[PDB]
Each structure stands twice: as C-alpha cells, then as structure tokens.
Write a protein that binds this ligand. Structure first.
Ligand SMILES: COC1=C(OC)C(=O)C(C/C=C(/C)CC/C=C(/C)CC/C=C(\C)CC/C=C(\C)CC/C=C(/C)CC/C=C(\C)CC/C=C(/C)CC/C=C(\C)CC/C=C(\C)CCC=C(C)C)=C(C)C1=O
Ligand SMILES: CCCCCCCCCCCCCCCCCC(=O)OC[C@H](COP(=O)([O-])OCC[N+](C)(C)C)OC(=O)CCCCCCCCCCCCCCCCC
Ligand SMILES: CCCCCCCCCCC[C@H](O)CC(=O)SCCNC(=O)CCNC(=O)[C@H](O)C(C)(C)COP(=O)(O)O
Ligand code: SF4
Ligand code: SF4
Ligand code: SF4
Lengths: 85, 176, 115, 115, 155
C-alpha cells in the first residue's frame, strides 16, 4: 500500500508532537522552528532525529540544516521517497 | 666483538640423522629435563623457617626510623630542618621553638612512614646524626593511623633500638 | 598576525557543522550505553547531559578552538562505544556524591571565606 | 543390584558434598559479587555470541574416526575365530582405510588450523 | 555449656582459614617483584600454608602491592567485589599505604584504603620479602583472634 502526500502530512506532524518542548498551539505548516516554535539549532537537530527513524531513511547534515519549517520536510522527503502524486 | 648465537646447521650424516631420529622418537631432551629435576630434587632446600631464624642483613640496612639522643640523654636533633629540606617524599614535618632551657629543639617531628621511601638521605642530612633508620624492618600495623609517626613515637623507637643504632653506626661511621 | 593555520574547519559554519554530527552521534549513542553499561539513569536522563555540555561550551567562537574540542568529544565518544570507559567513568559526568554547592553570596558568607 | 547400588551411593555422596558446600558457609551476596569475572574490568558483554572456533573440520572427522573405532573393537573376540586368514585381511583393511582417510584428510590441508 | 562447643567450633573454623589463606596474583609495581622473593625458595611462602592462586573467586587475602592509580582503581574494586567472603586486603608498601613517593601527583589515589577496606598495613619501599612475611603471619594471628560464632551465640 503505497503512501501519499497526506500519508506523510500526519506522520511528519505526528512525530513532531512527541517532542515535549514544542507547544501544541504553535504547530503549523509554515511555522518557524527558531522564531515561531522557538527552537535552537541544537533543538533543530533532534526533530530531525525523530524524523528519519520514524519514516525509515537517512538524511545527512548537508540537507538537514535548512529543513526548518514542517512542510520544508514534507516537500523534501517527497522527492527523497519520490512521492509526487 | 660479537658472537653468533643460533644458526648451527646440523650434519646430515647417517649417524647424526639417526641420533636426531632417536631423539625425536625416543624422547631424550625431555628425559634430560626429568633427570635434571630429579637431581635437583635431592638437594638441600634453600628455605629458612620464619621468625625462629631470620634472613641476613648488613649494618647499613634501612628500616624503621628513630630519633636518638646524646650519651648525656639530651636529644641530638637541633631542628635544622635539613632532613625536611632533603626529604624526597616530603614526609618530614618539623617546627622548632626556643625551649625553656634556651636550647634549640623541635616541638613537632611527625615522620609519615606512609610517605617516605627510605632513601636514607635524612640520616645523611643532619650533621648531628639525629634521625636514622633502625634495623627494624618489622613495624607493620593494623590501622593506617599507627604508621603516621610523631616525635614521641620516634623518640620511643630511639630508646628501644638504641643498642642497635649505636653498634651499627659504629661499624659504618668510617665508610661515610 | 591575524592569519592562523586552521585545524580542519575553514570558518564558523563548518565548525558549527562538526558539532552537529557529534551531537548526531552522541544522541544515537545514549540509549545503547544505558543498556550496555547497565546505567542507573534513564534514557531521557542521558540526552540532557549530552545536551547540557554543548551550550555549556557555547561562549567559544574561535574556529580553531571549536574544531579542537569536537575532536575531544569524538575521542570521548570513541572511548565510550568500545566500553573502554566503565560505569564509574560515565557516572563522573553526573556529579552525584559531591553535595550541591551554594550560589548566593549569603551562603558563601556563612560557609567560609571564599568567593 | 550391586552396580546401581554403587551408582546410587556415589551420586548421593556428591549431592551431600555440594549441599553442605552451598548452604553452610553463611552467604552474603551483593550483586557485584555475582557479576561476571573479566580479568579485573567489566565484561564487554556477550559470552553467548557464537564463538567461531577454527577446528571445525577436525571436529567432524573425529566423529567419523570414532564410528570406526567401534568397528575395530571386537578384534579381541575376532581373533578367536576359525578363519584368521579372512579375519586378518578384513582387519588390516580397516586400519589401511583409516590411515587412508587420514592421509587424504592430512594431505588436502584438513588437519591444519583455519586462520 | 554451649559456650565451650561454640569456642571449639570457633577454633576449628579460623585455624582452617589462617593456615590456608591464598594470596591472590595481584602485583602492581616495584613492591610486587620482591614479593616474588617471598615466594622464591629463600622464604617459601607456600610452606606457611598459602598458595598463590589467581582468579579472585578462589582467593582470600589480596596483596595490594604497588602504586594504586586512578585508571586502575575501578578495576581493583571490581576485583575486590568479586572475592568471596571472608576476604582480607593487606596494603603492601608505602605506595599503597597513602601514596608513597608519588603521594602528591595527579593520577594516584593517596592510599589503597580509599577504594577498599584495607587490613593490616605493612610498610616499606619496598617491604622486604620477609618484612611482609611477618605481615602475612600477623594476619594469621588476626584470623586466630576473631570471634564470629562467639558473637553469634551471644547475639
Ligand atoms: C602477577 O603477580 C604474581 C605474583 O604475586 C602478585 C606472584 O607472587 C607470583 C609468584 C608466585 C608463585 C607461586 C609462582 C606461580 C604462580 C603463578 C600464578 C603462575 C601460574 C601458575 C601455574 C601455571 C600453576 C598453578 C598451580 C596450582 C594452582 C597448583 C594446584 C595443585 C595443588 C596441589 C595446590 C592446591 C591444593 C589445594 C587447594 C589443597 C587441596 C584442596 C582441597 C579442597 C582440600 C581437601 C578437601 C576435602 C578432602 C573435602 C572435605 C572432605 C573430607 C574431609 C572427607 C571426610 C568427610 C566426608 C563428608 C566424606 C607470580 C607468578 C605472579 O604472577
Ligand atoms: C565442616 C565445617 C564445620 C564447622 C562449620 C561452622 C559454621 C561456619 C559457618 C560460616 C560462618 C558463620 C557462622 O559461623 O555462623 C553464622 C553467623 C550468622 O549470624 P551473624 O549475625 O553472626 O552473621 C554475621 C553478621 N551479618 C548477619 C550482618 C552478616 O555469622 C557468624 O558467625 C559470622 C560473624
Ligand atoms: C552519559 C554521558 C554521555 C556523554 C555526555 C557528554 C560528553 C561530552 C560531549 C562533548 C562536550 C564538549 O565539551 C563540547 C563539544 O563536543 S562541542 C561544542 C560546540 N561549540 C560550538 O559549536 C561553538 C559555541 N556554541 C555555539 O556556537 C552555539 O551556541 C551552539 C553550538 C551551542 C548552538 O548552536 P546554535 O546555532 O546557536
Ligand atoms: S627516609 Fe628518605 S623519604 Fe623517608 S622521611 Fe627520611 S628522607 Fe624522607
Ligand atoms: S633530624 Fe637531622 S636533619 Fe632533621 S632537623 Fe634534626 S638534625 Fe636536622
Ligand atoms: S612503595 Fe616503593 S617499592 Fe613499592 S611500588 Fe611504591 S615506590 Fe615501588
């Protein structure tokens, strides 16, 4: 059963909820981690940590540094997993 | 010059080959070892039974320290701090004071027998032969605190082993 | 003069980069040591200790310096995943037996003459 | 009668020996005392992982060797036969074959250790 | 009286221990080499009942002989914890009695006692192979003078 963009939609957002500091009110599609969500680059690291083991891939620091907005992850793992529908 | 140690090529004569073949087949160097130990079995053991008889030493042996005193009875230590200044382990800790008689003795002479390493420099240090290790290699204690000697224990050791220190120093005062 | 020989990094950015895969490796490393080393702390109780060192080491700005401790961190990580350290060595990070030290001036004044 | 009486007596005496050994001496267990011994430091952690020994080939051959030692064991009773001509030929066959099996086992490496 | 039979069983148990204590194979530094001379034919430690068994699972007295340092202190206490009960630790030499020559350095624990409950202290740098030969026998007297069951019968 191939997955869709909406299949990622929840699943990227879902794995983000597990982090304790992130506030349930401040999540959004375009929400800024550093400014809106209020993270640090260190805090930017482990929301990546939650994200590849959940989906099952590996993203290096070559690209892990600018995926900061939640949908910036979605449009990224879409091309990594070739989900284009 | 130098000497080669092991490259001795064995001869290939039939006598030599059979000798080696007999050696390998009928184990001989193994028997040579057995005969060796058996010969070294009927010797006289080098052991000595403990304290009933004790091992041999020399008059300049280094052991438990002691603070001797003059023939009059006055202590030799005039507290020149030379032994503290030469102590490699910094075990010597002394403070002096002008005594009631006016003489120059030390209030405290704690020697920490758990620090110093029995260099013997202290017996070489003081020009009055005040501190000196006794021949008593045996002063093992059950608690750590007992090893930390003060001035009082040092004088007691001086009063106990005085017969040995006078005799041993008498023997070796000419070699130094 | 100002021109100095850099160790590996060529400015702050990749110096900021190297501290990341150290954190990348350290974060992945915490849960298995808690299991392998039979530690008493929780898996959660290890990430903070890994974390808190990092911005404890935050005033540093020189690129050469940054690359110098990322090697020390890598070596510390190196000597950890081969169980070369022991339970005591790892636990030394958790200042456990050492009683809490006061911070306010008045408590400093009560205990003893020290700043 | 006698044989199992002898067998029973021996296991009984052994059981008492371990029983008084394992009960009498006033035990005191404190976990690290029961910890595995690893020459002074902690175990790396395994001891049940597959200990790949290198004499596997020599291992099975020993089984085949024993299978034919059972064959050549009835020789003391086989010598008391009326057809020693046949018995001698077949007996020497086994040792010739056993040497032959070893000779192939020897010449084609075999006996040598795996490195 | 039960005191008599307790004392008789008391003497039986300790006499077994003091005449069969096995010093471990635990050597560290300069203080260990001359302890071999104790095991050498000159003094022959084995004649007094002891055997130099390794494997702290099968040893009684631990001869901490040499400089006790930082990097090994976990290893020793793990080793000491592995030794069964009863267990004794003779701090042998000035290095293990407080730090010895290197008392003030940076990677030496000043005294073997700070890691282990240390029994009778034999001093020397090094203690003569005979000096702690008394140290071992003096421990045999300590084993002789214990009460154990005497306390138990009076507990
Ligand atoms: C690193 O540092 C080191 C040191 O220092 C710190 C050292 O010093 C030294 C130097 C010291 C040495 C001694 C040199 C050798 C030492 C080594 C470690 C080198 C390696 C050793 C070997 C290769 C050889 C090891 C040999 C051993 C252990 C000898 C074994 C054989 C023996 C005969 C000795 C042991 C004998 C024992 C234990 C006595 C018998 C056993 C019993 C259990 C007692 C009997 C019990 C019963 C009968 C049961 C009860 C039943 C009863 C009474 C019957 C009645 C009742 C009923 C109910 C039936 C070294 C080398 C060293 O490297
Ligand atoms: C063959 C051997 C025949 C003789 C065996 C005598 C019994 C030895 C048992 C081991 C030592 C303990 C003992 O004697 O009594 C147990 C008693 C048990 O009571 P206990 O209170 O004395 O035990 C020691 C103290 N605690 C409980 C804190 C560990 O222990 C002792 O006597 C040791 C002191
Ligand atoms: C159980 C025990 C487990 C093990 C326990 C932990 C064991 C030790 C781990 C390593 C500790 C080591 O001292 C430090 C190291 O490795 S690296 C320091 C990185 N220093 C910089 O990078 C420059 C200064 N800091 C910043 O630039 C930013 O403030 C910061 C990076 C903090 C956040 O970045 P943001 O973009 O602001
Ligand atoms: S014997 Fe040597 S090390 Fe010991 S106290 Fe005297 S001077 Fe110091
Ligand atoms: S013991 Fe000797 S060296 Fe030390 S203070 Fe006295 S005289 Fe001086
Ligand atoms: S006490 Fe002396 S002989 Fe023994 S290990 Fe230390 S320095 Fe060496």
């Amino acid at each position: 059963p191939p997955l869709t963009l909406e299949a990622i939609k929840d699943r990227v957002l879902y794995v983000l909820k597990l982090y304790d500091k992130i506030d349930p009110e401040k999540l959004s599609v375009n929400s800024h981690f550093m400014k809106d969500l209020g993270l640090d680059s260190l805090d930017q690291v482990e929301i990546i940590m939650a994200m590849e083991d959940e989906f099952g891939f590996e993203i290096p620091d070559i690209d892990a540094e600018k995926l900061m907005c939640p949908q910036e992850i979605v449009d990224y793992i879409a091309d990594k997993k070739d989900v284009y529908e | 010059t130098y000497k080669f140690v092991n490259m001795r090529e064995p001869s290939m004569d039939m006598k030599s080959v059979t000798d080696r073949a007999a050696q390998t087949l009928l184990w001989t160097e193994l028997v040579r070892g057995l005969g060796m130990t058996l010969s070294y079995l009927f010797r006289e053991p080098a052991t000595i039974n403990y304290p009933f008889e004790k091992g041999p030493l020399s008059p300049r042996f280094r052991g438990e320290h002691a603070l001797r005193r003059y023939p009059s009875g006055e202590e030799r230590c005039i507290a020149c701090k030379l032994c503290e200044a030469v102590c490699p382990a910094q075990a010597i800790t002394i403070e002096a004071e002008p005594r009631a008689d006016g003489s120059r003795r030390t209030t405290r002479y704690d020697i920490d027998m758990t620090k110093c390493i029995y260099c013997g420099f202290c017996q070489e240090a003081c020009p009055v032969d005040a501190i000196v290790e006794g021949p008593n290699f045996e002063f093992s204690t059950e608690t750590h605190e007992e090893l930390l000697y003060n001035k009082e224990k040092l004088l007691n050791n001086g009063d106990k082993w005085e017969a040995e220190i006078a005799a041993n120093i008498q023997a070796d005062y000419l070699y130094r | 003069g100002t021109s100095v020989k850099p160790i590996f990094s060529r400015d702050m950015n990749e110096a900021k980069r190297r501290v990341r895969e150290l954190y990348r490796a350290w974060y992945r490393e915490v849960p298995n040591t808690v299991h392998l080393f039979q530690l008493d702390i929780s898996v959660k109780q290890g990430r903070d200790k890994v974390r808190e060192m990092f911005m404890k080491n935050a005033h540093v700005t020189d690129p050469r310096v940054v690359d110098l401790l990322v090697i020390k961190g890598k070596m510390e990580l190196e000597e950890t995943i081969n169980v070369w350290k022991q339970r005591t060595h790892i636990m030394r990070f958790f200042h456990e037996t050492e009683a809490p030290r006061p911070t306010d001036f008045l408590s400093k004044f009560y205990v003893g003459h020290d700043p | 009668m006698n044989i199992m009486l002898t067998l029973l007596t021996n296991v009984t005496l052994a059981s008492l020996l371990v029983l008084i050994a394992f009960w009498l001496p006033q035990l005191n267990a404190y976990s690290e005392k029961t910890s595995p011994y690893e020459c002074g430091f902690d175990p790396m952690g395994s001891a049940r992982l597959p200990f790949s020994m290198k004499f596997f080939l020599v291992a099975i051959t020993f089984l085949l060797f024993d299978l034919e030692i059972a064959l050549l064991l009835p020789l003391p009773w086989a010598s008391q036969t009326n057809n020693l001509k046949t018995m001698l030929t077949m007996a020497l066959f086994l040792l010739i074959l056993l040497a032959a099996s070893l000779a192939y086992e020897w010449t084609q490496k075999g006996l040598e250790w795996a490195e | 009286r039960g005191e008599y039979v307790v004392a008789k069983l008391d003497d039986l148990v300790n006499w077994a221990r003091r005449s069969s204590l096995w010093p471990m194979t635990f050597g560290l530094a300069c203080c260990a080499v001359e302890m071999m001379h104790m095991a050498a034919p000159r003094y022959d430690m084995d004649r007094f009942g002891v055997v130099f068994r390794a494997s702290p699972r099968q040893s009684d007295v631990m001869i901490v002989a040499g400089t006790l340092t930082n990097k090994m202190a976990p290893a020793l206490r793990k080793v000491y914890d592995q030794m069964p009960e009863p267990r004794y630790v003779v701090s042998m030499g000035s290095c293990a009695n407080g730090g010895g020559y290197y008392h003030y350095s940076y990677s030496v624990v000043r005294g073997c006692d700070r890691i282990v409950p240390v029994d009778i202290y034999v001093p020397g740098c090094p203690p003569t192979a005979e000096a702690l030969l008394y140290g071992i026998l003096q421990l045999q007297r300590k084993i002789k003078r214990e009460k154990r069951l005497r306390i138990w019968y009076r507990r």
